[PDB]
Subunit: 58 residues, 4 copies
């Protein structure tokens, strides 16, 4: 049922920028489908976002 | 092979405090076993930490 | 011109919760008036938010 | 008494990478001299670090 899979390249659609690979997943009531995304510009740094904030790119 | 499972109650072992439930997982080279943890004090806010930073509590 | 000062007790108005003291300030084009807020529940952990996301409480 | 000033270009010295401009400052007991740093690769996204984690670059 997941929109993205591990290793998909994604970016934030709007506001603060972020772009890199899906490295993980999380689930809360506020964010029932969320992803961890490792920056492709800053190796090692990871941010987490709701699926609606992200879009996949090639 | 995972140290924690969804819904385990964990806290940060040292430095900045954080305590709540495991809600997710992530994997990078720097942090090959990491977890997302939703605060039990601040619903909705989630932080992510390496497994070595966390310990399970009852 | 600042809405809050160091040591004000604030909380997030909506979405993910956060509550504690103002401990700092930041300025970007996206967020020209932002604050660092140390949780009163999780000492040491700090999050940063735009002024519009926060409200002062006693 | 501050190590960096607004607009200094800094990077994380080790572990997860981060590089961009100083955009802010924070103070806690754990981190009595901390900085907010806006990524030069991902405009708008800001992370916060203790002074010991950062070094200035030209
Ligand atoms: N995503 C991560 O994992 C992560 C980790 C470390 C740092 N950060 C930092 O967080 C920032 C993300 O910036 P952004 O543009 O996505 O969001 P932002 O402008 O920093 O807004 C922060 C959050 O505050 C709330 N908010 C913002 N404006 C609001 C308003 N007018 N009214 C009510 N609430 C408002 C929303 O919080 P709610 O979500 O509570 O609605 C929003 O997600 C970056 O600087 C980033 O590096 C993110
Ligand atoms: N974990 C999250 O998801 C998350 C999200 C938003 C905000 N935060 C904020 O981050 C903070 C976590 O504080 P903390 O006590 O865990 O860490 P901290 O004292 O803020 O240190 C931050 C990071 O900088 C590096 N660092 C710190 N001291 C260093 C030193 N002497 N030399 C070299 N590097 C050093 C380490 O980075 P490296 O990891 O690169 O080694 C450390 O993990 C809290 O204020 C928290 O709310 C965390
Ligand atoms: N604030 C910090 O310093 C910090 C540090 C570490 C971790 N975090 C974590 O970030 C979370 C904050 O949650 P929250 O409720 O404030 O925000 P959220 O629901 O996690 O949303 C994250 C950000 O993604 C964007 N977004 C969310 N929904 C969107 C949508 N439908 N369309 C387009 N963009 C959308 C906004 O980003 P933009 O801001 O780019 O618009 C929003 O600020 C907590 O889990 C928190 O612990 C925050
Ligand atoms: N800095 C921010 O503003 C911010 C915002 C959002 C997301 N993040 C995310 O946080 C990450 C930073 O990674 P990093 O390499 O600096 O740190 P990290 O490897 O993610 O470690 C996280 C924190 O947990 C503690 N820790 C890590 N290893 C430990 C160990 N072996 N024993 C005890 N505690 C340990 C330290 O926390 P203590 O600090 O409590 O000692 C460390 O600062 C990135 O993925 C980044 O994008 C940071």
């Amino acid at each position: 049922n997941a929109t993205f899979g591990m290793g998909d390249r994604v970016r934030k659609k709007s506001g603060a920028a972020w772009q890199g690979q899906i490295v993980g997943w999380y689930c809360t009531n506020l964010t029932p489908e969320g992803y961890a995304v490792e920056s492709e510009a800053h190796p090692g740094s990871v941010q987490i976002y709701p699926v609606a904030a992200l879009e996949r790119i090639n």
